[model samples]
Target: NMAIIKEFMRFKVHMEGSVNGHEFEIEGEGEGRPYEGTQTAKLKVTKGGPLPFAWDILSPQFSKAYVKHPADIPDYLKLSFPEGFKWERVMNFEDGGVVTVTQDSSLQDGEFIYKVKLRGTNFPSDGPVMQKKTMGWEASSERMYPEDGALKGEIKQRLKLKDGGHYDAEVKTTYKAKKPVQLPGAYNVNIKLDITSHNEDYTIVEQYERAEGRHSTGG
Candidate 1:
């Protein structure tokens, strides 16, 4: 069950807007067909007064791995859920995140619907000196499944900062199913981000380099 499978992914983004009354445009393109488990990206930021900044960013490779049953869920993604649960909600993000999903089915036909509520904290404005504090984030998601497996998912996240400002994002994903033991290869993802802040104290642009190649999936 430990055998590794190959995966590939690519992201194309173009964002144009104003942050703190300063017009900015950002373009990013990245891909990961995993060679030595590494992904590469190019980012270009055009800020106030023709200050065009270009740099390279790295997004590590990840797998769309899943288990058929709750008992088979990886230890890292499994939390304190009831045993023998028919359906499960797996939250994929930092620690302290919470999610609730209710499964409902229609008696007349064979259609099932899920109501989801996702909440978490995110660091929208931070710096390199110290890890900045988090802001309030609330989100809602819609997911569809074929049988008991997921097929598509979409989420909209809204984060409010202390200065009465907000950063919102929309993420859409489509998945292809295999098995709990199957090594994966089919997923499409698109992400859109918008930021608006009126405070000068907040630093909206920051970057960091991790020491390791692959990110830590804490267990």
Candidate 2:
């Protein structure tokens, strides 16, 4: 083999830690008016455990993020992109998966609001679609900071599922960080929104995020 390695990429993941038992399904759409003169960033996310499902996610946190998952992807050669980086990879949230959001200096900044919306059509896909079903206590504000920092927030509201009736919502914000996100510059925090049924067993959570498609759909 006369193949020569010219480039390499590094990624870190820890399997020993993750929220256990709580099978909170997470999915959402987005929309945005990326700040002028901002470069867009993207990542392909997927499930870690068996029977994996994948999604191509993005950055520049536009409109709510449906801002559309790109309904169609090209087949052959690509359309275009900057040198070095290829846009792909999405976030996969499994029962015991991990989600880490870091600040990239190359990111844009501006005011944006992510609607903590609810997702319908789900028995909780044994693999991926298993998520989406939710209530309305959510986290929807993710804006770029002036310098660079982190973010974490929460929400709690009465909601109605696509197939169910009005009910009380309960969610607790949770997270783990490289180090307590300090301050100095403008940054966003990351908090977990876990709105589940009262039993904590097989419950329904209509996450305050109606975060949906370009049209911004919701139940």
Candidate 3:
């Protein structure tokens, strides 16, 4: 059985990065259905807006799109949770209510755990959709055990639909120590997502250019 555990530390995020670009193509399983086409998207960080918190996605096919800050998209999707996070509607196109993503991080047993949630109302119906996807990145040095001087862990994510349904996917990765390595200091982490649902499969992946910079200034 998989281990179940909660994280130990809490911090805010302030970082800048871009998706670069992505291509998703899936074939229809059933007959009589037209061969589905692939969808592509590109992302870039806005200049001169903020130190490390200005980014956007450029996709023509998908009018409604969103990317979570700090690279944790799944946690961003659960913003609806009471005493929970909330979703910030970034874009709405083609009758979709809102499109956005969320991210969250925690520390436990000297390890940092992160979760990203992506949610939207107007997703492709025929091809595979990216939902309830999550990836774990490196934790802050303060969150790691001193003996090993390493911080590593796994991340699992699931989707909860409006009609009482859910989907799960997860990815694991390792982290290397960097300069200024210390507890509570963040580290760079990378993740990739591959999704198969509906009648096709889609690949959604991304990399973190830098570790999330967060610190507890006050309350």
Candidate 4:
């Protein structure tokens, strides 16, 4: 809903399943859990820098803490899919649509399953609703065929509706890996887009007088 546009405007990175030693958290409160594939069921969804965490709960058990913004890609995924990453591949067919998995691997071995979800209301409905469209395959995948260590898969979900509407935009991913992957202790954070969004939100803090009072509540 447009009413929630500002809420959605607050860009955030959320965690679902687990991988590696860090399971990040949902964005509302800031910070995330870690250890997806690790003995932590805390959720198999923990896969990211040991970078995001709760300051209140932050301790030696944790090495670093910070929530991910649009700026932090390849932070966790690089660990699990060290040599490659997976992305949504959408193709169109007449009347309806077809869905399948394809992978581009650069190496022969590296065992892990990666899951990604893409959501946004800005997509174009290429043709008429066309009787509710259709799907010819599964919505997710379990097997990964990565050659040269890179998995090549084209994926997307298809649904036909009798109507169209307004909404926010967001994309989410989950990594489930069996082999121990790599993680970054510290990462670079100097992107203009990320900086600009943060600047707007923290405009209040820029004022010398209100800096202390207007600071972020979660951090």
* lDDT for each candidate structure: 0.29, 0.22, 0.24, 0.23
- The TM-score that candidate 4 achieves is 0.22
Measured by TM-score, the strongest candidate is 1
**In model 1, which range of ten residues has the least summed lDDT?**
53-62
On the 0 to 100 scale, the lDDT of residue 201 in model 1 is 35
TM-score for every candidate vs. truth? 0.25, 0.22, 0.23, 0.22
Kindly list the per-residue Cα lDDT of model 2 for residues 31-141, writing each as its tens digit: 222211111212112222321211111111112111112233110011111111111111223332323322211111221212121112212345222333434323333
Task: Give a tens-digit lDDT track for model 1, residues 26-143.
Answer: 4554444422223344444544433211111001111222212222222211111111112233332322222222222111111111111222222123411112232534333333
lDDT of 3 by residue, 134-178 (tens): 122222211111134433323343333334543332323223233
Best candidate (score: lDDT): 1
The per-residue C-alpha lDDT of model 3 at residue 216 equals: 20
Worst 10-residue lDDT window for candidate 2 reads: 75-84
Q: 1 or 2, which is superior by TM-score?
A: 1
Deviation in Å, model 4, residue 186 alpha carbon: 31
lDDT per residue for candidate 4 within 1-219, as digits (tens), equals 112111111112222322123334322111122121111101122334333211111110110111122322233343433343334333333333222222221112222222333211212345332222221122222222233333322223222223542111111212222344433222222111011111221211110000000111234
RMSD of each: 15.2, 15.7, 19.7, 20.3
lDDT of 1 at 187: 23
